[PDB]
Amino acid sequence: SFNQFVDYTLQDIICEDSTLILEQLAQISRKYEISFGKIYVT
Amino acid sequence: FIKRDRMRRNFLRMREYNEFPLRAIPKEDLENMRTHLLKFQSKKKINPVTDFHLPVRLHRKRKTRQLKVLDENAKKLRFEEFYPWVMEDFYNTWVGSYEAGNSDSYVLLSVEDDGSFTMIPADKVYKFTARNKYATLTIDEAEKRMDK
Amino acid sequence: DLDLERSNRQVWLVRLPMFLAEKWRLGKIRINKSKITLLLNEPHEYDLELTKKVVENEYVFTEQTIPKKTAIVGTVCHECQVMPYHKIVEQRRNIVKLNNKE
Amino acid sequence: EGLVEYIDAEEEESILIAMQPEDLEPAEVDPAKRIRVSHHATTFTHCEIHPSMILGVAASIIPFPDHNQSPRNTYQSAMGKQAMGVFLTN
Amino acid sequence: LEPGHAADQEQAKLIRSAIEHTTLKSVTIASEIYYDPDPRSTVIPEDEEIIQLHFSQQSPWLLRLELDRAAMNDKDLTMGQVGERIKQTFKNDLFVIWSE
Amino acid sequence: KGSRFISTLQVKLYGREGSSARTIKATLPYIKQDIPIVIIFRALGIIPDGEILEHICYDVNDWQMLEMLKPCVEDGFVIQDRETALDFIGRRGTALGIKKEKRIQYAKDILQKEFLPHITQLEGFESRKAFFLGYMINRLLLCALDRKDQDDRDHFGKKRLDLAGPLLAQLFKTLFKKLTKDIFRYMQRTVEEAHD
Amino acid sequence: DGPTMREITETIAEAKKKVLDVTKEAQANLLTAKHGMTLRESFEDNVVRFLNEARD
Amino acid sequence: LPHFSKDDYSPESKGFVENSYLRGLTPQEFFFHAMGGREGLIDTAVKTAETGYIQR
Amino acid sequence: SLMSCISVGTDPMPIITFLSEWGMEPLEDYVPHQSPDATRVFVNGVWHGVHRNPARLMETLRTLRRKGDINPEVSMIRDIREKELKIFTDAGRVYRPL
Amino acid sequence: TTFRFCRDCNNMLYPREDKENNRLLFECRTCSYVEEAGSPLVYRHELITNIGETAGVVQDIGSDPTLPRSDRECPKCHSRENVFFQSQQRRKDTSMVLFFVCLSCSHIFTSDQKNK
Ligand SMILES: [Zn+2]
Ligand SMILES: [Zn+2]
């Protein structure tokens, strides 16, 4: 279980919420996005 | 009949037809024109729109930084086209629907004016149903009627 | 003002394995009788299957409360599907179930 | 090689497990031997690797458990957890 | 048991029915709902014979039902008491005629 | 995979044995009350009564299931249009979708999204959702007609064991979620206040 | 005793025959449950009663 | 058990042990005796819960 | 039990994909009257269509599992009397060798 | 039972009291399509069950692994190999008769001596 979880599943949870986007108007507007990549474990 | 240990050394002891050439139709129309599959549930033999009626018209029918739910664009674009396709006269009626099960991997064999074919995939599929042919509906009286 | 070119064009739609599906994103029909056979282009030779000889109330249209330029191609004469050469396909099928991730 | 299969509870519903391989798989006396059933049935699909393996970790240590009143086995499995001994070599 | 009527096999069987709840559905097999054009004459043949027996303006529905003999013959009874019971249950409006 | 919804659709065979009103209501999530299922068949897009039964009683010759289906069918007489049913369902649960043009579209939201988090959570497969529902009510009549035993829920095949892997996962799933929300908060204020 | 063990086996075996006949009788729709219990209900009674009798 | 064909009401299948503690039980028999033995434990646990409470 | 092991769960995608390529008639196009004797196919309790010759299908599957084409932890059950074929790849099932 | 349906409308047909011709019609409550009644029967309840007792028999039932086997003959087929099972109606009141499956003429005979 633990090895399977560490190897495969742990990457999944990162994937489903990797990105969150933020936008604010101007006076053309601008928008900000933060995204997650591969997971690395020491 | 008891346990054993000394069997190991035994292992050491054991040791006509119509060829129609094809070609993908050019892509500029594919940008402008999207092709889909039409289907009916009339149970009719053909149910051709030729016999349906004339005319025919088929068409669909200060805040700060904020956490917004996400969605893949094609679904998001598909989220926006929620208007049902409707063909009418100005009296028989037809309304389509999305199936999303077999619009993915299909390329059709258009047997064109020439014997050869242009092979065309399907962008979408739609399920048009004959509706209101008997033309009865009680959307408002139903709530009262259910008490009898 | 929907356009109807013929609405009687025959089409033989086919379900294909992804390996066949992805490769098309020519043909040589050697119809034999009901021993339907198909000569693929070069690599294997996979025949056609009589998925359903007659298929009704299904039609092909194209589109270009606002309508668009809608044209109708025709009807599915016979729903078909590829008959997967096959040993390599079976080998490919076994190979297909042996992928992985990073 | 596909000589031994993996089976869960649901899969057990639709199989026919023979108890001991040579006891039953081939077709066809000391009274002190325990009386067993025969292999009248033929359409088997699996045979138990060894019936004694249905026990757990604590239970397995019981000598001749099939010669005991079953709740006694439970008691031994309980105490066996608090048996003074040597738990690790370090 | 009754003091004098003790150790009497048959006498006990008399009482056995007397208290035992006997639902009509416990003997019925099936119920048939028919349309009969004549209140007197019935399309089915088995119905016509009994009619003149109790004979010699009514709804054209027909209700017929079937019961098991042995289930009846466990708590043995007669349909004659059944019918008047049914009659006296609601009224003599529900014209009921039963097989013997 | 994904938020591990705890949506537990239920089917209720209303009406006791013998006594009338042997109609069957379901319970879609996020809905005020229970709903007769024949609406859902229309709601998912099965208008005629014959199609509804064909989605449940897979055998034509068998009729007792159809017999028990008869009352619930007539309970759906009041609706003959999917949208009418759909819009009506939108009324039936948390109707705060004040715009009626958005109130009826709320019904399609629940069925697509909140209804059966398994077989799909995209759009279009509404027919497939019906069949599973139609299959589900096929089982219920069978048990109600005593051709199958009551489902033993102590059977081990119906059990699953969650080891350290999944136990960490779901526990980690939430912990990671709270991390993101906090990162949004800091991300909001800097955009809010042009800070570093 | 060897004899006693053998006699035991006869006792167990004779019980099976009692069971076997009753089993088939049920399969021939012959067994008649007395008033107040089902056929299977009655069928189990004789079965269990035989085995307990046999052991005792 | 998966070791039996369906519809086997014979005593060795429905849970009658014919062997004796002197010469051990067969698995199918042995496993059954576990359930029968267990049922007492649960009951004895319950009686400690119930009888103790009632007596109070 | 000493032989017991717990399924870690796999991706069901290959099977379902493989199923379609071996005559599983898709459910969206299923017409029960037109195929009265169909065999419903489930995957982790998720109906994905019907079939018409399950016996051909079944032993074909097990061979793949025994070939190692299908991961051996994947449980699959053919229930003849119910006209139903089930497949499981869930994580957390309890399985033993045989 | 065995109730036809509408056409171009396809809905279940309620009965309609045809008194003038003194018969029974069947109406589609969706569209006014109406046709007669095919049988004088209207409704049967059938409190006791005698249908579905023989469920599961197909071309492949006898190829089941776990069913117990037997050796009696199939009467018409005169073949003395068969497979069998218990009554498929899982109801307590049901008797414990047996049903057998031929493999030669696939004739499905019960084990009853009372009424064949
Ligand atoms: Zn109609
Ligand atoms: Zn025969």
Strands F35-36 and C47-52: unpaired
**Closest Cα in chain B, distance from residue J26 (Å):** 17
Measured in degrees and rounded to the nearest 5, phi and psi for residue F33 equal -125, -170
Q: What single-letter amino acid sits at J4?
A: R
**Cα-based distances in Å from E33 to E40, E60, E61, E64, J46:** 16, 11, 8, 6, 11
Instruction: Tell me which H or E stretch contains C59.
Output: strand C58-63
Instruction: Tell me which H or E stretch contains F144.
Output: helix F126-144
Give the separation between CA C25 and CA F125, rounded to whole angstroms.
24
Question: How much distance in Å is there from the Cα of J84 to the middle of ligand 2?
Answer: 13
Give the separation between CA F140 and CA F148, rounded to whole angstroms.
9
Question: How much distance in Å is there from the Cα of B92 to the middle of ligand 1?
Answer: 15
Do residue A2 and residue F2 have CB atoms under 8 angstroms apart? no
Do residue H18 and residue G12 have CB atoms under 8 angstroms apart? yes
E strand spans, chain I:
5-8, 39-43, 47-51, 75-79, 84-88, 91-97
In the sheet that I5-8 helps form, which strands lie side by side, from edge to edge? D6-8, I91-97, I5-8
Kindly tell me the burial class for residue D24, based on how many C-beta atoms sit within 10 Å of its own C-beta (0-12, 13-18, 19 or more).
buried
For residue C100, give the chain A residue with the closest CA.
A8
Interface membership of F164 toward A (CB under 8 Å)? yes
The verdict on residue I26 lying in a domain is yes
Instruction: Tell me which H or E stretch contains C4.
Output: strand C3-11
**Closest Cα in chain I, distance from residue F45 (Å):** 13
Assigned token pair, G26: 């049920």
Considering only CA atoms, which of F94, F129, F135 is closest in space to residue F115? F129
Do residue B137 and residue F192 have CB atoms under 8 angstroms apart? no
Instruction: Tell me which H or E stretch contains B126.
Output: strand B124-131
Assigned token pair, I73: 């932890």
Architecture of domain J46-116: Single Sheet (2.20)
Instruction: Give the residue numbers spanning the domain of F12.
Output: 1-152
E strand spans, B11-54:
34-40
Choosing among 3.40.50.300, 3.30.450.90, 3.90.25.10, 2.20.25.10, the CATH entry for J1-45 is 2.20.25.10
Ligand closest to J73 (CA) is: 2
Assigned token pair, A6: 């560490």
Question: How much distance in Å is there from the Cα of J35 to the middle of ligand 2?
Answer: 43
Considering only CA atoms, which of J113, J104, J100, J97 is closest in space to residue J72? J100
Measured in degrees and rounded to the nearest 5, phi and psi for residue E84 equal -60, -40
Considering only CA atoms, which of D89, D50, F161, F156 is closest in space to residue D60? D50
Is E18 strand, coil or helix?
helix
Give the separation between CA E23 and CA J106, rounded to whole angstroms.
43
φ/ψ bin of F116: left (φ > 0), alpha (ψ from -120 to 50), beta (otherwise): left
**Cα-based distances in Å from F58 to F134, I30, I39, J12:** 9, 11, 12, 17
At a CB cut-off of 8 Å and minimum separation 6, what does I91 contact? Answer: F160, F165, F166, I7, I8, I9
**Cα-based distances in Å from E100 to B42, E17, E23, E80, E85:** 54, 21, 19, 8, 15
**Cα-based distances in Å from J73 to F186, G23, J53:** 83, 21, 21
Chain centroid to CA A34: 7
Is E12 strand, coil or helix?
helix
Give the separation between CA I36 and CA I49, rounded to whole angstroms.
14
Interface membership of D30 toward G (CB under 8 Å)? no
Is chain I touching chain E, with at least 3 CB–CB pairs below 8 Å? no
* Helix, strand, coil % over all residues of chain H, rounded to 5: 65, 0, 35
At a CB cut-off of 8 Å and minimum separation 6, what does I55 contact? Answer: I78, J60, J63
Ligand closest to J14 (CA) is: 1
β-partners of residue C10 are C75
Is E35 strand, coil or helix?
strand
Assigned token pair, B115: 């014997």
Considering only CA atoms, which of F60, F39, F65, F194 is closest in space to residue F141? F65
Ligand closest to J83 (CA) is: 2
Q: Angle at which helices G2-27 and G39-55 pack, to 10 degrees?
A: 170
Method: cryo-EM
Tokens 């997967």 sit on residue: C84
Q: Angle at which helices I13-20 and C86-96 pack, to 10 degrees?
A: 160
Assigned token pair, C24: 């098309």
The verdict on residue I3 lying in a domain is no
Q: What single-letter amino acid sits at B117?
A: F
Give the separation between CA H8 and CA G47, rounded to whole angstroms.
13
Do residues E42 and E62 make contact, with C-beta atoms less than 8 angstroms apart? yes
Give the separation between CA B30 and CA B32, rounded to whole angstroms.
5
Q: What single-letter amino acid sits at J28?
A: C
At a CB cut-off of 8 Å and minimum separation 6, what does F72 contact? Answer: F22, F23, F24, F36, F37, F38
Do residue B38 and residue C58 have CB atoms under 8 angstroms apart? yes
Chains in contact with chain D (at least 3 beta-carbon pairs closer than 8 A): F, G, H, I, J
Question: How much distance in Å is there from the Cα of H17 to the middle of ligand 2?
Answer: 38
Which residue, among H1, H3, H33, would best test binding to D if mutated, counting the most D CBs under 10 Å from its CB? Answer: H3
Strands I91-97 and I84-88: unpaired
Give the separation between CA F10 and CA F27, rounded to whole angstroms.
6
Read out DSSP for F43-98? HHT--SHHHHHHTT---SS--HHHHHHHHHHHHTTT---HHHHHHHHHHHS-----
Do residue J22 and residue E37 have CB atoms under 8 angstroms apart? yes
Chain F segment 151-170 residues within 8 A of D by beta carbon are: 155-157, 159
User: Domain-by-domain residue ranges, chain J?
Assistant: 1-45, 46-116
Number of domains chain I contains? 1
Interfacial residues of I (vs F; Cβ cutoff 8 Å): 6, 8, 27-28, 30, 32-33, 36, 40, 44-48, 90-94
Tokens 């040993």 sit on residue: C87
Measured in degrees and rounded to the nearest 5, phi and psi for residue I19 equal -60, -45
Do residues C38 and C32 make contact, with C-beta atoms less than 8 angstroms apart? no
- Preceding omega of B55 cis (within 30 degrees of 0): yes
Alpha carbons within 13 A on the beta-carbon side of F81: 19
Question: How much distance in Å is there from the Cα of J102 to the middle of ligand 2?
Answer: 4
Sign of the dihedral through C-alpha H25, H29, H34, H38: negative
Give the separation between CA F35 and CA F25, rounded to whole angstroms.
5
Would you say the CATH fold of J46-116 matches that of J1-45? yes
Interface membership of B73 toward A (CB under 8 Å)? no
Give the separation between CA H2 and CA D45, rounded to whole angstroms.
10
The verdict on residue I71 lying in a domain is yes
**Closest Cα in chain H, distance from residue J54 (Å):** 16
Do residue J67 and residue H6 have CB atoms under 8 angstroms apart? yes
Chain D residues inside the 8 Å CB shell of G9: 31
Read out DSSP for D3-62? -S-EEEHHHHTT--EESSHHHHSS----TTSPP----------EE-S-GGGGS-HHHHTS
Can you give the CATH number for the domain in which F67 is found?
3.90.1110.10
Give me the resolution in angstroms, 1 decimal: 4.0
Give the separation between CA H22 and CA H17, rounded to whole angstroms.
13
Do residues I47 and F132 make contact, with C-beta atoms less than 8 angstroms apart? yes
Do residue C96 and residue I67 have CB atoms under 8 angstroms apart? no
Interface membership of G37 toward J (CB under 8 Å)? no
Do residues D60 and D32 make contact, with C-beta atoms less than 8 angstroms apart? no
At a CB cut-off of 8 Å and minimum separation 6, what does A8 contact? Answer: C101
Can you give the CATH number for the domain in which I43 is found?
3.90.1070.20
Nearest residue, CB atoms, I47 vs list F131, F161, F166: F131
Instruction: Tell me which H or E stretch contains E34.
Output: strand E28-35
Do residue G38 and residue J92 have CB atoms under 8 angstroms apart? yes
Read out DSSP for I15-30? HHHHHHTTT-B-GGG-
E strand spans, chain A:
20-24, 30-34
Assigned token pair, J103: 């493999």
Do residue D9 and residue I94 have CB atoms under 8 angstroms apart? yes
